Coordinates of C-alpha atoms in Angstrom, one line a residue:
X1 CA 12.2 10.6 -16.1
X2 CA 11.1 7.8 -13.8
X3 CA 9.7 9.4 -10.4
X4 CA 11.8 8.7 -7.2
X5 CA 10.2 6.9 -4.1
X6 CA 12.2 9.2 -2.0
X7 CA 9.8 12.5 -1.0
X8 CA 6.6 13.4 -2.2
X9 CA 5.6 15.9 -4.6
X10 CA 3.7 19.1 -2.8
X11 CA 2.9 21.7 -5.0
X12 CA 2.7 25.4 -3.3
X13 CA -1.5 26.6 -3.9
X14 CA -1.5 29.9 -5.7
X15 CA -5.0 31.0 -6.2
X16 CA -5.3 33.2 -8.9
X17 CA -8.4 35.4 -10.2
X18 CA -10.4 34.2 -13.5
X19 CA -12.3 37.7 -14.3
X20 CA -15.2 38.6 -16.5
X21 CA -16.1 42.3 -15.6
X22 CA -13.7 45.1 -13.6
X23 CA -13.7 43.9 -9.7
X24 CA -16.3 40.6 -11.1
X25 CA -13.4 38.0 -10.4
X26 CA -13.6 33.8 -8.8
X27 CA -10.8 32.5 -7.5
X28 CA -8.9 29.5 -9.5
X29 CA -7.4 27.4 -6.9
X30 CA -3.6 26.6 -8.9
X31 CA -0.6 25.6 -7.6
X32 CA 3.6 25.9 -8.0
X33 CA 5.8 23.3 -9.4
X34 CA 9.4 23.4 -9.3
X35 CA 10.9 22.7 -12.7
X36 CA 12.4 19.1 -13.0
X37 CA 16.4 20.6 -13.4
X38 CA 16.1 21.6 -9.9
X39 CA 15.1 17.6 -8.6
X40 CA 17.5 15.5 -6.8
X41 CA 18.1 12.9 -9.7
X42 CA 19.1 9.4 -8.5
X43 CA 19.2 5.7 -9.2
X44 CA 15.4 4.3 -9.4
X45 CA 15.9 1.3 -6.5
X46 CA 18.3 3.6 -4.2
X47 CA 19.8 7.1 -2.9
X48 CA 22.6 6.9 -5.3
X49 CA 23.0 10.3 -7.1
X50 CA 23.3 10.1 -11.1
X51 CA 23.7 13.9 -11.3
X52 CA 25.9 15.5 -8.8
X53 CA 27.1 19.3 -9.1
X54 CA 27.6 19.8 -12.4
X55 CA 28.1 16.2 -14.0
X56 CA 25.9 12.8 -14.5
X57 CA 27.6 9.8 -13.2
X58 CA 29.4 7.9 -15.9
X59 CA 28.8 4.5 -14.4
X60 CA 25.2 4.9 -14.2
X61 CA 24.7 7.1 -17.4
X62 CA 26.9 5.7 -20.2
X63 CA 24.0 6.6 -22.7
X64 CA 21.0 8.7 -22.5
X65 CA 18.7 5.0 -22.7
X66 CA 20.7 3.5 -19.6
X67 CA 20.5 7.1 -17.6
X68 CA 17.0 7.1 -17.9
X69 CA 16.7 3.6 -17.3
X70 CA 19.0 3.3 -14.5
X71 CA 17.4 6.9 -12.8
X72 CA 14.4 8.8 -11.4
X73 CA 13.6 12.2 -10.1
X74 CA 12.1 12.8 -6.6
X75 CA 9.5 15.0 -5.4
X76 CA 9.4 18.6 -3.6
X77 CA 7.9 18.5 0.3
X78 CA 6.5 21.6 1.8
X79 CA 9.2 21.9 4.1
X80 CA 11.8 22.2 1.2
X81 CA 10.5 24.6 -0.7
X82 CA 11.5 27.3 1.8
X83 CA 14.7 25.4 3.3
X84 CA 16.3 24.4 0.1
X85 CA 14.6 26.0 -3.0
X86 CA 13.7 29.6 -1.7
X87 CA 9.9 29.5 -2.6
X88 CA 6.9 30.7 -0.4
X89 CA 3.5 31.8 -0.7
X90 CA 1.0 34.0 1.2
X91 CA -2.4 34.1 0.3
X92 CA -2.0 35.1 -3.3
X93 CA 1.5 36.1 -3.4
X94 CA 4.4 34.0 -4.3
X95 CA 8.0 34.8 -3.6
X96 CA 11.4 33.3 -5.3
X97 CA 14.3 34.0 -3.2
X98 CA 17.3 33.7 -4.9
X99 CA 20.1 31.8 -3.5
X100 CA 19.0 29.7 -0.6
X101 CA 21.4 28.0 1.8
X102 CA 23.0 22.7 -0.1
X103 CA 23.1 26.0 -1.7
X104 CA 20.4 26.3 -4.2
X105 CA 21.1 29.2 -7.2
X106 CA 18.3 30.7 -9.0
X107 CA 14.5 28.5 -9.4
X108 CA 12.2 28.5 -12.4
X109 CA 8.7 27.0 -11.8
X110 CA 5.4 26.2 -13.9
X111 CA 1.9 27.3 -12.8
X112 CA -0.8 23.8 -12.4
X113 CA -4.1 23.8 -12.8
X114 CA -6.8 22.8 -9.7
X115 CA -6.3 19.1 -10.3
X116 CA -2.2 19.3 -9.7
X117 CA -1.6 16.9 -12.4
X118 CA -1.1 19.2 -15.5
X119 CA -0.1 23.1 -16.2
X120 CA -2.6 25.9 -16.0
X121 CA -2.7 26.5 -20.1
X122 CA -3.5 30.2 -20.6
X123 CA -5.2 30.3 -24.1
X124 CA -4.3 34.4 -24.5
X125 CA -5.6 35.2 -27.8
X126 CA -7.9 38.3 -26.7
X127 CA -7.8 38.3 -23.2
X128 CA -5.9 40.4 -20.9
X129 CA -3.0 39.2 -18.3
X130 CA -2.4 40.9 -15.0
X131 CA 0.0 40.5 -11.7
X132 CA 1.5 42.5 -9.1
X133 CA 5.6 42.3 -9.3
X134 CA 8.0 43.7 -6.9
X135 CA 11.7 43.4 -8.2
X136 CA 13.1 46.5 -5.8
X137 CA 15.8 43.8 -4.3
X138 CA 16.7 43.1 -8.1
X139 CA 19.9 44.7 -9.1
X140 CA 22.0 44.7 -12.1
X141 CA 22.5 41.0 -13.5
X142 CA 19.5 39.4 -12.1
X143 CA 16.4 39.2 -13.6
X144 CA 13.1 37.7 -11.9
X145 CA 11.0 36.7 -15.0
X146 CA 7.3 36.0 -15.6
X147 CA 6.8 34.5 -18.9
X148 CA 4.6 31.9 -21.2
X149 CA 6.0 28.9 -23.4
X150 CA 4.5 26.3 -25.2
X151 CA 5.1 23.5 -23.0
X152 CA 2.3 20.5 -23.6
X153 CA -0.1 20.5 -20.9
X154 CA 0.9 17.0 -19.1
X155 CA 5.2 18.1 -19.9
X156 CA 5.2 15.8 -22.6
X157 CA 3.9 12.3 -20.4
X158 CA 1.7 11.3 -23.6
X159 CA 4.2 11.7 -26.3
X160 CA 7.3 10.2 -24.5
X161 CA 6.2 7.3 -22.4
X162 CA 9.4 7.4 -20.3
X163 CA 8.5 10.2 -18.5
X164 CA 6.4 9.2 -15.8
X165 CA 6.1 12.8 -13.7
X166 CA 4.7 14.8 -16.7
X167 CA 3.5 17.8 -15.2
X168 CA 3.6 17.2 -11.6
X169 CA 7.4 16.9 -11.6
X170 CA 7.7 20.0 -13.8
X171 CA 9.2 18.0 -17.3
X172 CA 9.2 19.7 -20.5
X173 CA 10.7 22.5 -20.2
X174 CA 11.6 24.1 -23.5
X175 CA 11.7 27.9 -24.8
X176 CA 12.6 30.1 -27.7
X177 CA 16.3 30.0 -26.6
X178 CA 16.6 26.3 -27.6
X179 CA 18.4 25.6 -24.0
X180 CA 21.0 22.8 -23.9
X181 CA 21.0 22.9 -20.3
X182 CA 17.6 21.2 -19.6
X183 CA 18.4 18.1 -18.1
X184 CA 15.8 15.6 -19.3
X185 CA 14.1 16.4 -23.4
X186 CA 11.7 13.9 -24.8
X187 CA 11.4 11.9 -21.7
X188 CA 15.1 10.7 -21.5
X189 CA 18.2 11.8 -19.7
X190 CA 20.1 14.6 -22.0
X191 CA 23.2 13.0 -20.8
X192 CA 25.1 12.4 -24.2
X193 CA 27.8 14.8 -24.6
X194 CA 27.0 16.6 -21.4
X195 CA 29.6 19.4 -20.7
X196 CA 29.9 21.7 -17.4
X197 CA 29.4 25.3 -17.9
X198 CA 32.7 26.8 -16.4
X199 CA 32.1 29.2 -13.1
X200 CA 28.1 27.6 -12.8
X201 CA 29.1 24.8 -10.3
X202 CA 25.4 23.4 -10.7
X203 CA 24.6 23.4 -14.7
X204 CA 25.8 22.1 -17.7
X205 CA 25.0 21.7 -21.2
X206 CA 23.7 17.9 -23.2
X207 CA 23.5 17.2 -27.3
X208 CA 20.0 18.2 -27.2
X209 CA 18.3 21.7 -26.9
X210 CA 14.3 22.5 -26.4
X211 CA 12.7 24.5 -28.7
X212 CA 9.6 26.3 -28.2
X213 CA 7.7 29.7 -29.0
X214 CA 7.8 32.1 -25.8
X215 CA 6.2 35.1 -24.8
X216 CA 7.8 37.2 -22.5
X217 CA 5.9 39.3 -20.2
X218 CA 8.4 40.5 -17.7
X219 CA 12.4 40.5 -17.8
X220 CA 13.4 42.8 -15.4
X221 CA 14.9 44.3 -12.3
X222 CA 14.9 47.6 -10.9
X223 CA 17.1 49.2 -13.2
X224 CA 15.2 47.8 -16.7
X225 CA 12.3 46.0 -17.9
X226 CA 11.1 44.2 -21.2
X227 CA 8.6 42.3 -22.9
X228 CA 9.4 40.2 -26.0
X229 CA 7.7 38.2 -28.4
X230 CA 9.5 34.9 -29.7
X231 CA 7.6 32.7 -32.4
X232 CA 9.5 29.5 -33.7
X233 CA 8.6 27.3 -36.9
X234 CA 6.5 25.2 -35.5
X235 CA 5.7 27.0 -32.0
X236 CA 5.5 23.2 -30.1
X237 CA 8.0 21.6 -27.9
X238 CA 10.6 20.0 -30.3
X239 CA 14.1 18.3 -29.5
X240 CA 16.7 20.0 -31.6
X241 CA 20.0 19.3 -32.3
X242 CA 22.7 20.8 -35.2
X243 CA 21.6 23.7 -36.6
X244 CA 18.0 23.6 -35.8
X245 CA 19.0 24.7 -32.8
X246 CA 20.3 27.7 -33.0
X247 CA 23.2 27.5 -31.0
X248 CA 25.1 30.6 -30.3
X249 CA 28.6 28.8 -30.2
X250 CA 28.4 28.0 -33.8
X251 CA 27.2 31.2 -35.7
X252 CA 23.7 30.0 -35.8
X253 CA 22.0 32.2 -33.6
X254 CA 19.6 33.1 -36.8
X255 CA 19.5 29.8 -38.4
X256 CA 17.7 27.8 -36.0
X257 CA 13.8 27.4 -35.4
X258 CA 13.5 30.1 -33.2
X259 CA 13.3 33.8 -33.0
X260 CA 16.1 34.0 -30.2
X261 CA 16.2 37.7 -30.2
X262 CA 12.1 38.4 -30.3
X263 CA 10.8 41.0 -30.8
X264 CA 11.3 43.5 -27.3
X265 CA 9.6 46.5 -26.3
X266 CA 12.2 47.4 -23.4
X267 CA 11.3 51.2 -22.5
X268 CA 15.0 52.3 -22.0
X269 CA 16.4 50.2 -25.3
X270 CA 13.5 52.2 -27.0
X271 CA 14.9 55.7 -25.4
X272 CA 12.8 56.6 -22.5
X273 CA 15.4 56.1 -19.7
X274 CA 13.2 58.1 -17.4
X275 CA 10.3 56.1 -17.4
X276 CA 10.9 52.9 -15.2
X277 CA 13.8 52.9 -12.6
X278 CA 14.6 52.9 -8.4
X279 CA 13.0 56.1 -7.2
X280 CA 10.1 58.4 -6.6
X281 CA 10.8 60.5 -9.7
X282 CA 10.7 57.7 -12.6
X283 CA 7.2 57.4 -14.3
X284 CA 7.2 54.1 -12.4
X285 CA 9.1 53.6 -9.5
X286 CA 10.9 50.0 -9.1
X287 CA 11.3 50.4 -5.4
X288 CA 7.9 49.7 -4.8
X289 CA 5.4 47.1 -5.9
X290 CA 3.5 47.6 -9.1
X291 CA 0.6 46.3 -11.4
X292 CA 1.4 44.8 -15.1
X293 CA -1.5 44.8 -17.3
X294 CA -0.7 43.1 -20.5
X295 CA -3.5 43.2 -22.8
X296 CA -3.5 40.5 -26.1
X297 CA -5.3 42.2 -29.3
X298 CA -6.4 40.3 -32.2
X299 CA -7.4 41.4 -35.6
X300 CA -11.4 41.1 -35.4
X301 CA -11.3 41.5 -31.8
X302 CA -12.1 38.2 -31.3
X303 CA -10.6 34.7 -30.5
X304 CA -10.6 33.5 -33.9
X305 CA -8.4 36.8 -35.3
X306 CA -4.8 37.0 -35.5
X307 CA -2.7 38.1 -33.0
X308 CA -1.6 41.7 -34.0
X309 CA -0.8 43.7 -30.7
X310 CA 1.0 43.2 -27.7
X311 CA -0.4 46.1 -25.7
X312 CA 0.8 47.3 -21.9
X313 CA 0.1 49.6 -18.9
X314 CA 0.9 49.9 -15.4
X315 CA -0.9 50.9 -12.0
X316 CA 0.9 51.8 -8.8
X317 CA -0.8 53.1 -5.8
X318 CA -4.3 53.7 -8.1
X319 CA -2.2 56.0 -10.8
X320 CA -2.6 54.4 -14.3
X321 CA 0.8 54.8 -15.9
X322 CA 0.2 54.1 -19.7
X323 CA 3.7 52.8 -21.4
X324 CA 6.4 54.4 -22.2
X325 CA 7.2 55.1 -26.2
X326 CA 9.7 54.5 -29.0
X327 CA 11.9 58.1 -28.7
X328 CA 14.1 58.1 -31.9
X329 CA 13.6 61.3 -34.6
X330 CA 11.7 59.8 -37.8
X331 CA 10.4 56.6 -36.2
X332 CA 6.7 56.3 -35.4
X333 CA 6.1 56.8 -31.3
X334 CA 5.0 52.9 -31.0
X335 CA 3.6 51.9 -27.5
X336 CA 3.4 48.1 -27.9
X337 CA 4.5 45.2 -30.3
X338 CA 3.2 45.1 -33.4
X339 CA 4.4 43.6 -36.8
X340 CA 5.5 47.3 -38.1
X341 CA 6.9 48.3 -34.7
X342 CA 9.4 45.2 -35.1
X343 CA 10.5 46.0 -38.3
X344 CA 10.6 49.9 -38.1
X345 CA 12.7 49.6 -34.8
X346 CA 14.9 46.2 -35.8
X347 CA 15.6 48.3 -39.0
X348 CA 16.8 51.4 -36.9
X349 CA 18.8 49.1 -34.4
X350 CA 20.7 46.9 -37.5
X351 CA 19.1 43.7 -36.1
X352 CA 18.3 41.0 -38.7
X353 CA 14.2 40.8 -38.2
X354 CA 14.0 37.0 -37.2
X355 CA 10.5 37.7 -35.8
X356 CA 9.8 38.4 -39.4
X357 CA 10.7 35.6 -40.6
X358 CA 9.3 33.3 -38.0
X359 CA 5.8 34.3 -39.1
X360 CA 5.7 37.5 -36.7
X361 CA 2.8 38.4 -34.9
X362 CA 0.9 36.0 -36.4
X363 CA 2.7 32.7 -35.4
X364 CA 3.3 34.0 -32.0
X365 CA -0.7 33.9 -31.7
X366 CA -1.4 30.9 -32.7
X367 CA 1.1 29.4 -30.0
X368 CA -1.2 31.9 -27.8
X369 CA -4.6 30.5 -29.5
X370 CA -3.3 26.7 -28.8
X371 CA -2.2 27.5 -24.9
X372 CA 0.6 28.1 -23.0
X373 CA 2.3 27.3 -19.8
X374 CA 3.0 30.3 -17.2
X375 CA 6.9 30.1 -15.9
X376 CA 8.0 32.3 -12.7
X377 CA 11.5 32.4 -12.5
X378 CA 14.6 34.2 -10.9
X379 CA 18.2 33.8 -12.2
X380 CA 21.5 35.0 -13.7
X381 CA 22.7 35.1 -17.0
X382 CA 26.2 32.8 -17.1
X383 CA 26.4 33.9 -20.9
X384 CA 26.2 37.4 -21.3
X385 CA 25.8 38.5 -17.2
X386 CA 22.2 40.4 -18.3
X387 CA 24.2 42.9 -20.3
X388 CA 21.3 42.6 -23.0
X389 CA 18.4 43.4 -20.5
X390 CA 20.0 46.2 -18.2
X391 CA 23.9 47.5 -19.8
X392 CA 25.4 48.3 -23.2
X393 CA 25.2 45.0 -25.5
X394 CA 27.1 44.4 -27.4
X395 CA 29.4 46.2 -23.9
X396 CA 32.1 47.4 -26.7
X397 CA 29.3 49.5 -28.5
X398 CA 28.5 53.1 -28.8
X399 CA 25.5 53.8 -26.1
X400 CA 24.4 56.5 -28.4
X401 CA 24.2 53.9 -31.4
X402 CA 20.3 52.8 -31.6
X403 CA 19.3 49.8 -30.0
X404 CA 23.0 49.4 -28.1
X405 CA 21.8 50.8 -24.3
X406 CA 19.6 48.8 -22.3
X407 CA 19.8 50.4 -19.3
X408 CA 22.2 52.1 -16.7
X409 CA 24.1 49.2 -15.5
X410 CA 28.0 49.2 -15.9
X411 CA 29.1 46.5 -18.6
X412 CA 31.3 45.2 -15.6
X413 CA 27.7 44.0 -13.9
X414 CA 26.1 40.7 -13.8
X415 CA 28.9 38.1 -13.5
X416 CA 27.2 35.3 -11.8
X417 CA 29.8 34.4 -8.9
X418 CA 29.1 38.3 -8.0
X419 CA 25.8 38.6 -8.1
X420 CA 25.3 35.0 -6.1
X421 CA 27.6 36.6 -3.1
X422 CA 26.5 40.5 -3.4
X423 CA 22.5 39.4 -4.1
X424 CA 22.1 36.5 -2.4
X425 CA 19.3 37.5 -0.7
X426 CA 17.1 39.0 -3.4
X427 CA 13.8 37.9 -3.6
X428 CA 11.3 38.3 -6.7
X429 CA 7.2 38.7 -5.7
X430 CA 4.5 37.8 -8.1
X431 CA 1.4 38.1 -6.5
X432 CA -2.6 38.4 -7.3
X433 CA -2.3 36.9 -10.9
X434 CA -5.7 38.1 -13.0
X435 CA -7.0 36.7 -16.2
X436 CA -9.9 37.4 -18.3
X437 CA -11.9 39.7 -21.1
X438 CA -9.4 42.6 -22.2
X439 CA -10.6 45.4 -19.5
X440 CA -11.5 42.9 -17.0
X441 CA -8.5 42.9 -14.6
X442 CA -8.2 46.1 -13.0

């Protein structure tokens, strides 16, 4: 995309901590940038929309190349962050409102480095990543997500010279779902064969998808939470078409370059329904804030080893809370993501181990070694109504069959039109982000 001249781009300042030992950290003066999908797209030498509602203008965008020549994405000024997009920062806390009323629904954002010209790339192997979260106002059907993806640090600017904005304009998004709803891919409008998504007034799908590796630290609302590894072959940003995208709609979910299911550790799905929930007698009380700690263990305990284990623990009101465990007869009580856990649990659930097909923890680790961009988002799910996270999936499945039940939400929950009314004022908060060696962040 070209860059427009109507509004300066002003990312929100967000300090994080880089740590060397427990309680010995230094501030890193980073910032938050809005994903290019949420930006106004208009004519390069005017005010005329190139995209309105869920459609590209066919006169301006008869082809992707012409669209890209004629159109530009514009900046987010400071005033518009809260007023238009529902984003705000107080000290080291970042807040994202779900619906902001001209009416904005959801948000996806990235962490910029201290220069505000590149994404802050995190080399996560043999490191610990930690943050405080509040998901108390997110119920069934919503997801306040924090995760990493194998985006380029410059959003693709060096690879795709028609991308003028780079990381500064939140470009280059890709993930392990190979999404077609990304409006700008490889420096070009994804306007070919663009199709609105029914019941989604703001979104559509273009000819291409954009694939890359994804490490989900946090997919969650107050009812259920998960962390998940998604390797791809290769891991780096890859525009896809046809079978390579692994499109759900053509029966290709397991035929593409990315592991779409991922290998998940989701406490409720692993059959501990009392670990996490909205109340003081759950082990971890989702009505109150808490700290989420993630440790990325290698084979030799060094930065050069292969990724072998994703460990997790929590801190809430000064109380250390170890992760829940897998709880099925004849299955080891795993409390972390490893290749063995993935094989054993997917075996039990009858899920295809595409994680293993894509190179497993080792391949996931190669993405983490090269460095990944931090994503913070809030969203509802127009495909599957978040049932995969917090309900029975498939909805018609027996909840006593291992793998089906992922949370207590009813199978009628999560319809975007309903959650966008009922949960309009939901806000996820991510704060006090800390990064360092294992054992350094609490």
